[PDB]
Amino acid sequence: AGTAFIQTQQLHAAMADTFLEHMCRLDIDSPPITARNTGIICTIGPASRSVETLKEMIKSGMNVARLNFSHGTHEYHAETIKNVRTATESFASDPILYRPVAVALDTKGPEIRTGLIKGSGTAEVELKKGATLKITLDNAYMEKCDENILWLDYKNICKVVEVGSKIYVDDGLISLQVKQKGADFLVTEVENGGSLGSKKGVNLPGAAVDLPAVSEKDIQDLKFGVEQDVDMVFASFIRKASDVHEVRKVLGEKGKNIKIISKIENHEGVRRFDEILEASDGIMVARGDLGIEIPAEKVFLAQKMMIGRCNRAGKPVICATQMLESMIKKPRPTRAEGSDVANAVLDGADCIMLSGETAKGDYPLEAVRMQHLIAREAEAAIYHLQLFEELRRLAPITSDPTEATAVGAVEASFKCCSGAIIVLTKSGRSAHQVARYRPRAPIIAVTRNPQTARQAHLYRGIFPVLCKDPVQEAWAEDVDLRVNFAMNVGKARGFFKKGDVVIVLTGWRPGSGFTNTMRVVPVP
Amino acid sequence: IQTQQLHAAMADTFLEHMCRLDIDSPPITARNTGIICTIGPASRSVETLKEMIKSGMNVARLNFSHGTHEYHAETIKNVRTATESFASDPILYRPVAVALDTKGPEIRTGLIKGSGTAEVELKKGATLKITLDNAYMEKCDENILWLDYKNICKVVEVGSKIYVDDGLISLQVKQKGADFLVTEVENGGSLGSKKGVNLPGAAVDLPAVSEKDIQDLKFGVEQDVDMVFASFIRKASDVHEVRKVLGEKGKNIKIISKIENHEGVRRFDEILEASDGIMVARGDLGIEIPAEKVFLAQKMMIGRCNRAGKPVICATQMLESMIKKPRPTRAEGSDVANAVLDGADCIMLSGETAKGDYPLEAVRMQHLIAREAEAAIYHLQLFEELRRLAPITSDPTEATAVGAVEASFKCCSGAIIVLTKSGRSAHQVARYRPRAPIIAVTRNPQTARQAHLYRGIFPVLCKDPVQEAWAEDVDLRVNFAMNVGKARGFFKKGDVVIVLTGWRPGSGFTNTMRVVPVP
Amino acid sequence: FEELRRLAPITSDPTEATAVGAVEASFKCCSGAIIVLTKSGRSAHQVARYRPRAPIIAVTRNPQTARQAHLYRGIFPVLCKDPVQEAWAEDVDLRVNFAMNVGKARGFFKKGDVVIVLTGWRPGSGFTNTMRVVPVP
């Protein structure tokens, strides 16, 4: 089998009257009665790169493999991809057990990195609380950083910063307040002490950081992605609509189908969220990176807002960073980490992304299993009913065949207590339009296009499944084949059993543009 | 000064309401969730407390796990001195409650071999013998370990876990015995002297009130505390014995039951019924039940307390980084917020304020987070659901109380002013979770303090003498609250507020609602 | 009622907000009546506008308003000829207890049922702003 593969459901429990009443019925002692619908993106790196590790991670519920292009060469990551694809395809000899797995390319982005600390690349220095530290743009100091002077590469840092602004260094381990501006320098006072190292990430709280959207390194990384046929791109440090447009433009005609997830990493991104969301295919709320750049008592408000708007607009949203960080060192997570993951699933996220945990952790395989366990337990606390009733009200009244059918499918999934909604689809769009309305039941999305099978994991509650059977001549039999394929998948997964009811979305003519034909089918 | 800016028309759907959250605009609502600070070494002084009350402390907790009766008597005296410093202007007088947190029943280990402070390495896979023989009680080491709980052999089976030093070390039982256990170390660590032992999912049959606590609870009654946080509650009869010890003399002292273990969560319903309120101790649960199921417990317990209309308090692991640092982490702010949004009435700061380097900033961040989180609450559905789920009765007070909340939404009221002796009339309003603050006016100083337990009650102590003409005595107290509310910033000249009063001085019920424009 | 409440325009008028709450409560308490003290009749009309189930016993000293009230549905007007008591609170209690006796005689309610009562607070305050839930003596 796998560990995470057999998610048996026990549908037909009549859903509660009110959201309050639903919380009151949560029994921690009973097991979860629902498929884990929230996708799981694991970052691949040193500890999980091998073909044998990946096989077990896919079995334990990995869906997307992220590659971090901040570090490593093109040759290095080409083999990381080859290993993912070998591991994924190991299960292909039984199409029922074949879970597809996506490949994500996370850009380096624009960044502000410090210089090399005095006697060699690895040596640190103590910045203590209240000491003066000079920041310089003069390249003479770029391998001569110490307690007193610090280089960094961003040449317009003097222009976007004023007196009194903060500068967070090494992902907010150290924080500095500017006392005096200058021609090509700043004089700062250390507030939070720490061990400063070589080439560390600097952030500039609420500054219009005017770097290029796509650095010249990234223009090569994005072409490598297109060349390697990645499925999605996590574009870093997005500030505005035109940043996303230039990420699109670089991918071009050749990789137009590659999905662009914009990462909201800074204050400017959150302010311009609406224009970014419109231009982006999805969103990634990078919480740790926001925690530097905006106040701690306002980050949860940003997360909720962004997750909210993405749900309304029907685009994926991903909750990244600071998920299960203790599992780099330890075999289990803390109470507060499990609660943090849960509350992100309940806020409405589609996917959860494990950063260090799986890339360079001592426990990469258990990290996936805890993520899976938390996401499935959290699923029981979701009151799917109001998510839907609100999403139906807020949607604009149109006479589109597909969207009216898609709603009715979800509608019926509640009234029939359906085990699933089976959706036949080439592009994935028909399945996405169903998932937009947040059903309780899993959406088994059947397809022949292998990319759409991979790209589907971005959406919540879609279980993609790749049909490799040849197209039957009689159109009606080709449907019956693919439907009966999903029936067998769903029975094997445990979503439903002999004699339950499921909803099925299909076309009517092979040639009709729309997925317009809904039917209520009892399971053979 | 929590200025409100009422009259913003509330959103259509909860989804739409989340979508309207702008982090850049300031919060448009009074911080309704109470703040309980634990007083200790860093915050004990009269001068520290004055600034903490100013920055939004409501309840002062005293931890009776540590310290003497003489020590805590003076901690209380300092709270009362600081509180009363503001009494010379009754408009600015915020009352402040005193909470007595019991030690409880516990399982403590012995003293490690050569001295009280000296550790030993338990390594992963080594055998460790647990013993009830008192000969070893000051001779613990890598091999043998004493502990005081004499029936430990009876409640544990082969294969059960034993977490030691608040879950730093964990041991699996291999062999039971007459008066011993043989365990295998799973999580290694530095074992010390007198450490807390827990027994995951065991019917731990210790006394509900230890003999130490029977003296601590009489000291509480003697010092006129306002509430008692009873520790390690497992079942209804535990709460009943905490009640029985307080007795006739301290019958008015509120008993908040702390749910610290697996058995408490299983029997939550019977405990909630017998308790005045609840405290979800999250860190202590995180030891005894799995980490992927604690948030489910918190949500359930906070849920049921909201339904039943009793206070619930979210304690432990709130802002722990602020022991050492002047600000909290992103994840701590999010953890506090999500507990306010889950539906908690109060938030309790443990170390942060007791023995922290930054006790005063810890209160200010708690206040800031709780006020920002307030904007994310969709008060409307909380109410509509609570109204539906409530049982149909023709009680005068409860029907009036609902109508007051009802009207608080339709008039976009700045407040609900409630006159009350016992506090009950104000509690019945707060039960239905209005958006507006509830200014609860009273002459009884204890009810003013005990009100902070409930969410959205702003208690205020009227020290004026009782006017002969009953109607003027009402008008006085109402106009007192009007001035408080204007000073706080809850509302201004020309806004509307709801006012609950009696009709006869003698009528049992708070039955008279009126919609009043602010003079 | 639920439709008439939705379609009504949101205002912070004391009288209209009280009047709705009176009807609201008339359903939740299963009230036998809504007793309304009124000179012009308007306070009773504003209650009747929202179409309660319970009868509205409208108490008044103005004999014309007692007659003109029959136009409105569910108002049972009743003319109090007692003189105005000096203590305002007793003058209310008189008129309320007058309607209680009318309502018991009509059969609208009996000893121990609940009724809603709309009054003023100051003799001088423009609004009928004071609602109370009263058990029948």
Residues of C in contact with B406 (CB under 8 A): 21, 24
Sheet holding B169-175, edge to edge: B144-146, B127-131, B180-187, B169-175, B161-164, B197-198
Q: What is d(CA C69, CA C51) in angstroms, rounded to the nearest whole number?
A: 15
Q: Which CATH superfamily is domain B1-30+374-519 in?
A: Pyruvate kinase, C-terminal domain (3.40.1380.20)
Chain B neighbours, 3+ Cβ pairs < 8 A: A, C
A130/B contact by beta carbon, under 8 A: no
**Is B269 near chain A, with CB under 8 Å?**
no
Q: Using CA of residue A290, residue A294, residue A300, residue A304, what is the dihedral sign?
A: negative
Which residue does chain C place closest to B503, by CA atoms? C132
Q: Out of B396, B410, B470, whose CB is closest to C17? A: B410
Name the B residues in 281-300 with CB < 8 Å from any A CB: 282-283, 285-286, 289, 291-300
The residue assigned the tokens 């994005």 is A222
Nearest to B65 by CA among B354, B458, B262: B354
Cα A100 from Cα A86, distance rounded (Å): 12
CATH architecture of A1-35+379-524: 3-Layer(aba) Sandwich (3.40)
Going through A6-148 in order, the beta strands assigned E by DSSP cover: 39-43, 64-68, 102-106, 125-127, 132-136
> 3-state SS of B293-331?
HHHHHHHHHHHHHHHHCCCEEEECCCCHHHHCCCCCCHH
What's the CA gap between B27 and B513, in Å, rounded? 29
Report the SS3 class of residue B28. Answer: coil
A440 is in an annotated binding site: no
> Does the beta carbon of B175 lie under 8 angstroms from any beta carbon of chain A?
no
**Rounded Cα–Cα distance for residues A340 and A335 (Å):** 9
List residues in chain A that are followed by a break over 2.5 Å (C to N).
none
Name the percent of chain A in helix, strand, coil, to the closest 5: 35, 20, 40
Q: At what angle do helices B46-54 and B69-84 cross, to 10 degrees?
A: 50
Cα A497 from Cα A524, distance rounded (Å): 8
Nearest to residue A289, comparing CAs of A168, A403, A372? A168
Chain C residues whose CB is inside 8 A of the B513 CB are 18, 21, 130-132
Which residues on B lie below 8 Å from C28 (Cβ)? 392, 399, 402
Chain A nearest CA to B133, separation (Å): 34
Burial class of residue A503, CB neighbours in 10 A (0-12, 13-18, 19+): buried
User: Nearest-CA neighbor of C15 among C44, C40, C39?
Assistant: C44
- The Cα of A36 is separated from the nearest Cα of chain B by a number of Å equal to 14
- Is the Cβ–Cβ distance between B145 and B173 less than 8 Å? no
C78/B contact by beta carbon, under 8 A: no
Best CA proximity match to B346, nearest among B278, B433, B405, B293:
B278
Element (H, E) at A167: strand A166-169
State yes or no: A369 annotated in a binding site.
Answer: no
CB-based contact, C79 to chain B, within 8 Å? no
CATH number of the structural domain C1-137: 3.40.1380.20
- Chains in contact with C via at least 3 Cβ–Cβ pairs below 8 Å: B
> Chain B residue closest to A371 (CA)?
B292
Its sign, for the CA torsion B323, B329, B331, B335, is positive
CB A104, CB A232: distance < 8 Å: yes
Is residue B159 within 8 A of residue B139, CB to CB? The reply is no
Q: Are strands B120-122 and B189-191 parallel, antiparallel or unpaired?
A: antiparallel
Q: Give A341's contacts (C-beta < 8 A, 6+ positions apart).
A: A323, A324, A352, A371, A374, A375, A378
Do the Cβ atoms of B396 and C17 come within 8 Å?
no
Kindly list the domain boundaries of chain C, sorted by start residue. Answer: 1-137
The residues near B110 (Cβ < 8 Å, ≥ 6 apart) are B136, B137, B138, B139, B140, B145, B146, B147, B193, B194
Distance separating alpha carbons of residues B472 and B329, to the nearest angstrom: 52
Catalytic residue among B108, B249, B324, B327: B108
Interface of B with C in 412-451 (CB under 8 A): 412
The answer, yes or no, to whether C and A have at least 3 beta-carbon pairs within 8 Å is no
Chosen from B10, B394, B406, B496 to mutate, greatest number of chain C CBs within 10 A: B394
Q: Name B338's Cβ contacts closer than 8 Å, sequence gap at least 6.
A: A300, A339, A343
Task: Let me know if B258 is a catalytic residue.
Answer: yes
Cα→Cα distances A384→A408, B276, B303, B362, C11, Å:
16, 33, 17, 37, 35
Per DSSP, B519 falls in state -
| Strand pairing report for B169-175 and C130-135 | unpaired
* B416-419/B496-501 β-pairing: parallel
Q: What are phi and psi of A483, to 5 degrees?
A: -65, -50
Between CA A398 and CA A313 the distance in angstroms is 16
Chain A contact partners (≥3 CB pairs within 8 A): B
Specify whether the CB–CB gap between A343 and B334 falls below 8 A. yes
Q: Cα separation of C102 and B236, whole Å?
A: 51
Count of all residues that appear for chain A in the document: 524
Spatial separation of the C-alpha atoms in residues A109 and B94, rounded to whole Å: 52
B329 classed as catalytic? no
Whether B300 sits inside 8 A of A394 (CB atoms) is no
A343 belongs to an annotated ligand binding site: no
In which residue are the tokens 């109607």 written?
A: B471
The two tokens of residue C130 are 């004071």
Angle between helical axes of A74-89 and A51-59 (0-180°, round to 10): 50
The shortest C-alpha distance from B391 to chain A (Å) reads 14
Q: Which of B33, B38, B183, B316 is catalytic?
A: B316
Does A77 carry a binding-site annotation?
no
Which strand (E) or helix (H) includes residue B334?
A: helix B330-342
Mutate to test the interface with A, among B186, B272, B296, B377 (most CBs of A within 10 A): B296
Three-state helix/strand/coil letters over B100-163: EECCCCCCEECCECCCCCCCEEECCCCEEEEECCHHHCCCECCCEEEECCCCHHHHCCCCCEEE
User: Who among C12, C25, C28 is closest to B411 (CB)?
Assistant: C12
What Å distances lie between residue A71 and A75, A238, A389, B85, CA to CA? 12, 19, 45, 60
According to CATH, the topology of domain A36-109+213-378 is TIM Barrel (3.20.20)
Q: What is the DSSP letter of B206?
A: -
Domain B31-104+208-373's class? Answer: alpha beta
Instruction: Report yes or no: C63 at the B interface, CB cutoff 8 Å.
Output: no
Three-class secondary structure assignment of B386-398: HHHHCCCCCCHHH
C4 touches chain B (CB under 8 A): no
Cβ pairs A/B, distance under 8 A:
166
Q: CA–CA separation, A394 vs A26, rounded Å?
A: 29
Evaluate whether A290 touches A264 at the Cβ level (below 8 Å): yes
The β-bridge partners of A354 are A42
| B385 in A contact zone (CB under 8 Å) | yes
CA–CA dist A237, A213 (Å, integer)? 8
Interchain pair C17, B394: CB under 8 A = no
B506 is in an annotated binding site: yes
Q: Looking at the DSSP assignment, which residues form a beta bridge with residue A422?
A: A444, A504
Q: Please tell me whether B63 is known to bind a ligand.
A: yes
Measured distance CA(A517)–CA(C108) in Å, rounded: 59
